[PDB]
Paper text:
Two new modified [name] (Bt) proteins, [name]_7 and [name].868, with activity against fall armyworms (FAW), Spodoptera frugiperda (J.E. Smith), were evaluated for their potential to bind new insect receptors compared to proteins currently deployed as plant-incorporated protectants (PIPs) in row crops. Results from resistant insect bioassays, disabled insecticidal protein (DIP) bioassays, and cell-based assays using insect cells expressing individual receptors demonstrate that receptor utilizations of the newly modified [name]_7 and [name].868 proteins are distinct from each other and from those of commercially available Bt proteins such as Cry1F, Cry1A.105, Cry2Ab, and Vip3A. Accordingly, these two proteins target different insect proteins in FAW midgut cells and when pyramided together should provide durability in the field against this economically important pest. Taken together, these results support the conclusion that [name]_7 and [name].868 are effective insecticidal proteins against FAW that have the same pore-forming mode of action as other three-domain Bt proteins but bind to different receptors, suggesting that they would control resistance and increase product durability.
[name].844_8 containing the S282V, Y316S, and I368P amino acid substitutions exhibited a 50-fold improvement in activity toward CEW while maintaining toxicity toward FAW. The [name].844_8 and [name]_7 proteins have 100% sequence identity in domains 1 to 3, and the full-length proteins were observed to readily undergo proteolysis using trypsin (data not shown). The resulting activated cores are comprised of the same pore-forming domain (D1) and same putative receptor biding domains (D2 and D3); correspondingly, their receptor utilizations were expected to be the same. The FAW activities of the [name]_7 proteins with and without preproteolysis were comparable, suggesting that their PTX domains (domains 4 to 7) do not impact their stability or their receptor utilization in feeding assays. Consistent with this observation, the [name].844_8 and [name]_7 proteins were also comparably active against FAW in insect feeding assays. Both Vip3A-SS and Vip3A-RR colonies were highly susceptible to the [name]_7 protein, showing 50% lethal concentration (LC50) values of 11 and 12 ng/cm2, respectively, and all insects were dead at concentrations above 316 ng/cm2 [name]_7 (data not shown).
Residue numbers in the entry: 28 to 593
Write the structure that this text describes.
Amino acid sequence: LETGNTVADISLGLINFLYSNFVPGGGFIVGLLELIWGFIGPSQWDIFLAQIEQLISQRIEEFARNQAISRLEGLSNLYKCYVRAFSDWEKDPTNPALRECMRIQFNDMNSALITAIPLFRVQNYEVALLSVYVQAANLHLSILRDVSVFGERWGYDTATINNRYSDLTSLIHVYTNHCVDTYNQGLRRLEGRFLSDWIVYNRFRRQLTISVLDIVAFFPNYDIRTYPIQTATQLTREVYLDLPFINENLSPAAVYPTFSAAESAIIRSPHLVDFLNSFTIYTDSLARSAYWGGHLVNSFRTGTTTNLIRSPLYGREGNTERPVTITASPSVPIFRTLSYPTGLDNSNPVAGIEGVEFQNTISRSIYRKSGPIDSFSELPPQDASVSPAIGYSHRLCHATFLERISGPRIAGTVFSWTHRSASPTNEVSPSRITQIPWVKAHTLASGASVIKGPGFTGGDILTRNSMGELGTLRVTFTGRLPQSYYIRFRYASVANRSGTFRYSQPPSYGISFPKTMDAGEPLTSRSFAHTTLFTPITFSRAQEEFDLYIQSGVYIDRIEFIPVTA
């Protein structure tokens, strides 16, 4: 019985927790132990390394490799002691002896992490180590936040607490930049000329978006000065499954599409987040082999279910069987596909999909027949202790199509998914600092473009080549009205720039974007900063519509709502 991606399983369980429980205290301290550091043994760390080693065709040098694994086992034992010292100290916090135990454990944990981290980026093996690096970096930022919140009650003096907060602040950027830089270099190494190369490249991007980049996106939340109450990051990136090939050694290379052809056909260029409303699937055939030969997609954007965007036609509109319609909705998403690729018979003349079962949270719909290629394998549910309809991690977003009519015939349907944290409603609650990426807007103003994100924000970003509007973003305030919030923007800027913030009522507000970078340098962790509107706004309608006008040279990542009280 096939196992599925155990690293994806562990990662998405961790992501679920980071989204739902990112708030200081023993619950978070025990959560990391229960989900990672008291759960993963050397057996499983081996798989972490090997999953990347197989993708890049490079085994970590053996001494460095066993050094990493035993170092991770060392951190597990230390973190067990740390959690134990915290549970103890929590019950009798004034006890000077318990306070000394925690100060000892923290000092031990921090030192072990300071020395272990470089062993997770050993020269020439940084990519293969990257998913264990991100786990150690995460643990490090978490205990540095721990001391920033509790260190005084543990008995640390003011200077060392300030020193650790300065460490947290610098290392958010250092760890972020290392993960993104290493990820980009791993991707570059997998660029090649042919479709066979694209398959590996596309798998790498999926597997490391989930096991590394998705965790990096939460790193800024560990800054308690910036996020003094609970906050949740939305992962808005699209992740893609595989082309419907069984044998992925596509030979000879000359008879198959190029790398650029596949990338350009399969990966949607940057856009506002959308959600599946329906597929219309057209069945075609070659002699007696029937397959998914083309389709339309109908999508809606966040908060606005009634304005559907119809895709251009993918593939051909065959008539071998009547068109089939597959539907989803905001609260009835499709969370699982079971695909039957034609290549399950080595003799079929088309590379494509003979059938798919779609499972939604209520019922099922089958295009032609069910198959064994299971979305749960690469995108497992974020909670396995509960039914799949309750515990899924991703919702079916879109489907693209690599078409080759001549040569070996290709009907390359590929499914794309959005993570559960990117809800189809931008909800703002007075008990959270709410983060809303601007790609969750529902209109894109003319002259505004969605551009590819750097890698650490969790999704794509907005900019303009000349001053003007981004587009309207819809919000629903939950709970008893009225509510008052400070507005804050995460942005990057090549110069001192400004903008204007509007909602559907007449008071508008100027926003400033002090320079964060130089024109022409790449976006890196420190290129993004926060800017705050210090006049709070009070809202009294549940549904609200926001606009942002910006000058050029500004990149917008997200808007944030900081409750004035509660």
